[PDB]
Amino acid sequence: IESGVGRLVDADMNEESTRLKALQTQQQLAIQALSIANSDSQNVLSLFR
Amino acid sequence: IESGVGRLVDADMNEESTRLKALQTQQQLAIQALSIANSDSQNVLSLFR
């Protein structure tokens, strides 16, 4: 019964580690893209000066 | 919804800057033309010395 509970409930931690690394990389990319998207709106100031 | 509101309400600032420059130039030309028109009037004084 304990073995059945384990196979039904436990998680193979290797793919969770892979997902953790992948989400860290995705978050880094998202922060970089968000910074670029925030910064790019300042280009309009050139015309008015 | 907010993006739709922005699409319906926002204005592209490049076109507004172009219009602002055009209207400033048109105002300058109109003022010059008005000055020329005002200066046109007093030329008649030469006939009556």
Curated annotation (Swiss-Prot), chains A, B:
Compartments (UniProt record): Secreted; Bacterial flagellum
Q: Which residues form a coiled coil?
A: none
Its biological purpose is as follows:
Flagellin is the subunit protein which polymerizes to form the filaments of bacterial flagella. Homomer of FlaA is able to form a functional filament.
Family, according to the entry, reads as follows: Belongs to the bacterial flagellin family.
**Under what name is this protein listed?**
Flagellin A
Query: What gene name is given for the protein in this entry?
Result: flaA
